[PDB]
Amino acid sequence: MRLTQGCFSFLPDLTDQQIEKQIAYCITKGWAMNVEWTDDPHPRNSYWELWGLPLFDVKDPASVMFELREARKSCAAGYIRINAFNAAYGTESCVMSFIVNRPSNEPGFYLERQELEGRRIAYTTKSYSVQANPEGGRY
Amino acid sequence: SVSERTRIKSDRYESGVIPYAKMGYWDAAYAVKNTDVLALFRITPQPGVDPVEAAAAVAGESSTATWTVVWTDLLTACDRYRAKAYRVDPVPNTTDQYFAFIAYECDLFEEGSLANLTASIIGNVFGFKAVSALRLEDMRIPHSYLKTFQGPATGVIVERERLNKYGIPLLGATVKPKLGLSGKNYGRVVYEGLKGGLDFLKDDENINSQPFMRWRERFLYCMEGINRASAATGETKGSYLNITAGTMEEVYKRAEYAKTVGSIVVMIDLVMGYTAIQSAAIWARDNDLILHLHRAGNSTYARQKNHGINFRVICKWMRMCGVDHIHAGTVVGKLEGDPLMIKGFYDTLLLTHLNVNLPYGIFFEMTWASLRKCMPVASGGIHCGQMHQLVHYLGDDVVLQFGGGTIGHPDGIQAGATANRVALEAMILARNEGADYFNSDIGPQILRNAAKTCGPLQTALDLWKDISFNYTSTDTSDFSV
Amino acid sequence: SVSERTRIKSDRYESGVIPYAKMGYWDAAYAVKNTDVLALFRITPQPGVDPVEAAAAVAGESSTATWTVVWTDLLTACDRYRAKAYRVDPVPNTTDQYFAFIAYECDLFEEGSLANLTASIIGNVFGFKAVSALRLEDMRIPHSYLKTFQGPATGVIVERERLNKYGIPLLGATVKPKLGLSGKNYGRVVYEGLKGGLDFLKDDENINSQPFMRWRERFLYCMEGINRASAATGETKGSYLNITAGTMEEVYKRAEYAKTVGSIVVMIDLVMGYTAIQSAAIWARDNDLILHLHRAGNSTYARQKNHGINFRVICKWMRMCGVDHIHAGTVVGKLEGDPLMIKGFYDTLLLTHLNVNLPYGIFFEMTWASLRKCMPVASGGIHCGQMHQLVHYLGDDVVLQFGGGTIGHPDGIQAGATANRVALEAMILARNEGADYFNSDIGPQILRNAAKTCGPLQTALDLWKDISFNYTSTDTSDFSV
Amino acid sequence: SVSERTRIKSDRYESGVIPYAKMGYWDAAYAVKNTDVLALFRITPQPGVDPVEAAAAVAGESSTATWTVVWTDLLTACDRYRAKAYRVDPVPNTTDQYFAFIAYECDLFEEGSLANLTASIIGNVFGFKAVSALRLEDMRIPHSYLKTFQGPATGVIVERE
Amino acid sequence: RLNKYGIPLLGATVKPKLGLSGKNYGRVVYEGLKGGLDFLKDDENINSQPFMRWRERFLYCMEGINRASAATGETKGSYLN
Amino acid sequence: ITAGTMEEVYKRAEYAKTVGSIVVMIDLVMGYTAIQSAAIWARDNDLILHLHRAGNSTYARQKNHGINFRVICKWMRMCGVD
Amino acid sequence: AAEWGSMNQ
Amino acid sequence: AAEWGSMNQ
Ligand SMILES: O=C(O)[C@@](O)(COP(=O)(O)O)[C@H](O)[C@H](O)COP(=O)(O)O
Ligand SMILES: O=C(O)[C@@](O)(COP(=O)(O)O)[C@H](O)[C@H](O)COP(=O)(O)O
């Protein structure tokens, strides 16, 4: 299965030139950029692991491209994403996020159904990779 | 007699009828305060009536005046409570139409209550015999009064965080046909649409609890369809459950059920009324739910330029009550919408402050005192063949909804959903790379290029290629540039 | 592919766009059933649009249709759920206006719910680009559906018994000025007016709870004024306490307080909304209170003949919800009102059955299935000098209200109240003896004769002798005789 | 290491301790707004402490500041949330006493809550080692904030009645 | 209740005092606890304000606490105001 | 869930729902008003309602006197048993 | 006309 | 015109 989190997941994996252009678009707005990693893709897993501090006043995509290159050869198999933050009054939140690296294979998830009162069910979403191996060796 | 000797002989408080403009309701040299509420009215006087007298009549009958002199006024600080007409101007390119500005004291209104504000501004003035037509065009609500209202329960920023979705418009669809389906068939459509790639689906405004389908059945099957789709894609999904009902008690019963089964969102209709709406917005904040507002009935009074209330005013009132989403127009769809007026609506719902902009219908500068933003919704006869226009006119904070444009696909509902998502992703990417996607040639070619890697999209483009709705608009601007 | 091989090739269910009139929404040979809901619309087509296509579009978009073909229709008994246009005719003396009749199946609506009925009839049709204007003129609500609603909580018959008052119109007045008075000064006016001879007084629609006067203070002083006046005259008296508020919880808190202190009646405003109104009418029946409805906001959509909703429809909906009183017009006052249209309104609210009457705007025959009667209220710039006209146009089941016409008397509030009661008593007596009181000469002489035994009345006649409001009406009839 | 390469080098957001008056908490050319909350404090500086630094310390520790630089400030509209000292005057007929005026943004407080207002104005400033004594003399509460509170239940007028 | 004996407990306050959103608040809690703190706390002046409503803060904080406890094998917590 | 008083009936209905029963049953000897109350509860709580016709043959057996069962059928379909 | 009373039984 | 911005301070 293909994980559909992010804004461009219905398009093929993007090339390095493609990634650089999107970065160039965020810096022209004055946004701060950062890179994150994880091996637990549950949709309610809000905090991915941080790769260094956010690049606040960098004004050249080459600096961002370099950092992503390092993570790629340094981190274990899993997922990597690039985010952009806007600290303007009225926003003070993230304004863009897309995946930029995937594992060779993703088995996906399945549902568990606990029966409670009347006809009500309490659902739990479960990951095949997580349930099988500890962090660092899931993919 | 004692009564005869105690008669008031003052020129202003002696019994009898005098013009409203001599009663103290007209003041050209009035100085406006930062706590005052202001209103702009488009008035059409009856043959013979003086334009200034008409303005003074509207101000008096919407504040503290009646048709004849009353001495009881002397038991109060009368001058402080009277509303004041302070400017009157002819409408450009028109004879018999005039614009009128009116100021109201802060102490005239009850804190945090929309029923009270409207009781004064729109209570009885529209039925006065001395005017032939009347329309409320705009209002300036001061910072002090804004602080007595909650504002949106969730707000655009917190909502995108709840869905983990950033940097692109959200997507959705309505279940069709409008009426006739059972609860089990309803869940099947939801499962299919979400699985193909929609963020949300919704019940029609007229779906509540009927002989062909009772509400409890629909809510149960829908939660099974949502969980199935989320587990198959790895994304957070949802459907707008309709809690509209005949009595407040029944509304609350349906809201508490949806929360129990774990719904992230619910929807209400405008026909319910201001007080029911305010109660629902307070409940959503106290129970962590998103609140969607359908505007059923608005066009009975917001369509004609000569009489009624302009939608931009409704936008302000609903942002004050605290709804999270609201329908606001598509420009190219099958319902009414002038591009300049629509851009005005979107600004009123998303900005932190408004500056005067006549061509857009913005008459008053106004700050939102840190009230959260309300998300606009675009719906009504639109298709993936028009993606380039939607991105250019509606912006990035918006929910694009496709009912017939999804279920009407020849290869199934899942195929329809895929064609819509792909079209959007390709257009945004191209935009961010600096292309002229709005050009009548570049835009369609971009979609054609994407179509050569997605069969569903190719099929949809060929099917609705020559589909458009061109008709003269009813509500238009009065200024240019 | 499996999807490509399983494509629908039926002429009616193949993908694509076809006219609404070929989708099954137009049927000139349709036979109406006694369980069907019917509607009459005045439509104005855009240049080029066929009159029959417009009618078919309104029927489809208000029932189960969308802009393109959907196969999901085959999972339902489609033919039974589709609304059907069955008659279209040009409006007399007009070009570009047409009348359209439409029938709806009983199973389309939720039992006992006004929000649901309106969601279908007025939801989105008024905003369609293909029409330039639209107006709902009338409706036929069947016996079967009427039986799912409560109807008036008290009703005219039970109410006259609660007051021990029979055989003459009731009398009342509004406190003035509209805003600014304290709770203690409010009670003083109530005491004075009732003591002079009024049956009831009322708070203004915009009086709720404000800095100059909190509600609990007003309710306490008013009950002291009512008991004082009743003990001094030997009659049952009362005042309409306003319970309008921003949230349902606050509404209930104010209703329970008024009942605790022993109020016989309370009042609500139309700006509150349908769902809040229905809840209040159920509470009044369960707690033995009379419920008065002020129609604040109605003229935003009920004033123009080309677009909106006619008041006679609002009359039917409110009688179904179960209010006990409703404002309905004066003809000779300062607010809009054509005599033929007004007579239609009064009949809709008081009769046990309606028969077709075009000159009065009655388009459908209809029985009320034993629902109780709603009492009409006449208010707005009227004076005792017009008594002969009021008796002739408004009838005997009505509340005549005099605000400025009572407080504006030079000799005090008690004097004003006396002049109004005497004028009425003399006119009814004369009528019952068989006189032509409506003649422009007999009527005034009758009042003059009575005045020679009552100084207050003499003073009032001389003061408002030449007072009238003559202006061309906006909402008029389309038939004569 | 990634952490070492991603260290902040900006003069204002590099790690370390700097005076409160250079952190943006002193602004003699500040323009007061009609929505701002204002406070007047009588301060007595410790021997050696500059009168202006003391005022800046009171403003920072009663708003959003701490004893050392934090980069997390860049995740917020920092300039809007900082309180600002804008005037300092010697107390007449006194040596070692000064009056200080301070302005606070409306969005810093919870509507209708006195516990919250006091938590900011009198929370910990009175125990600061750098001052020897301190007194809150007056405050200007704006119209906008007043409207979120009930005010007297009865009031003098209704009570006499 | 904490299974901690024979040494002072450790903690920290979230900074800056005011201005952060509920999601950014949870991020700091997750980070601090994961590095080895027993507890973190809201500032005395953090309650419910326009920049952050209380229900949002409480939800994100419990996600940060559970994540840190599962990654270290220790009982953790944060003082909710 | 048949019992001697309405309060005891409700106590047994709420227990069965708590443990997750898809269905419950009642007897005709309970009476029309108790039956109507139970049918309203089942709709509001998503349970199936079975009706046993204990006592019907005391008046529905002979052709010369009593009530024919087809009438009882209509009344019970109106009350709302499943 | 009078066909409105016969078209709506 | 531009007097609407000065007439409403
Ligand atoms: O009932 C309908 O017609 C819709 O579901 C459209 O479905 P389609 O996608 O099939 O057209 C929407 O409610 C309208 O857009 C409402 O209008 P508005 O947004 O202007 O309030
Ligand atoms: O506010 C007012 O103007 C009135 O109190 C009139 O007082 P006066 O007696 O002093 O005129 C009534 O509410 C109007 O009649 C309402 O109009 P309608 O009945 O048409 O809904």
Author numbering:
A (entry chain I): 1 to 139
B (entry chain A), C (entry chain B): 4 to 484
D (entry chain H): 4 to 164
E (entry chain G): 165 to 245
F (entry chain C): 246 to 327
G (entry chain c), H (entry chain b): 83 to 91
In the authors' words:
pmcAlmost all biological CO2 fixation is catalyzed by ribulose 1,5-bisphosphate carboxylase/oxygenase (Rubisco), and about half of this activity is performed by marine photoautotrophs. To achieve significant local elevation of CO2 gas concentrations, the volume occupied by Rubisco needs to be minimized, which has led to the convergent evolution of the pyrenoid, a micron-sized, membraneless organelle of the chloroplast stroma. We report the identification and characterization of a diatom Rubisco-binding protein pyrenoid component 1 (PYCO1), which contains prion-like domains (PLD). The identification and characterization of PYCO1 indicates that the convergently evolved red pyrenoid matrix, like its counterpart in green algae, is formed by LLPS mediated by an intrinsically disordered repeat protein that contains multiple sticker motifs that bind to the Rubisco large and small subunits.
We determined the structure of the Rubisco–PYCO1(452 to 592) complex using cryo–electron microscopy. The resulting density map revealed that distinct PYCO1 motifs bind to both the small and the large subunits of Rubisco (2.0 Å resolution). Four instances of the previously identified sticker motif “KWSPRGGS” could be modeled into the density map surrounding Rubisco’s central solvent channel formed by the small subunits. The motifs adopt a helical conformation and collectively form a square-shaped plug of the central solvent channel. The interaction between the small subunits of Rubisco and the PYCO1 sticker tetrad is mediated by a network of hydrogen bonds. The structure revealed an additional interaction of the Rubisco large subunit with the PYCO1 fragment, the motif “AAEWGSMNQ” found near the C-terminus of PYCO1 (residues 577 to 585). The element adopted a helical conformation and bound to a largely hydrophobic cleft formed between the two domains of the large subunit near Rubisco’s dimer–dimer interface. The indole group of PYCO1 W580 is inserted into a hydrophobic pocket formed by LSU residues F102, F104, L361, F366, and F482. However, the interaction between Rubisco and these motifs is relatively weak because mutating the SSU-binding motif of PYCO1(452 to 592) was sufficient to eliminate the observed native PAGE shift.
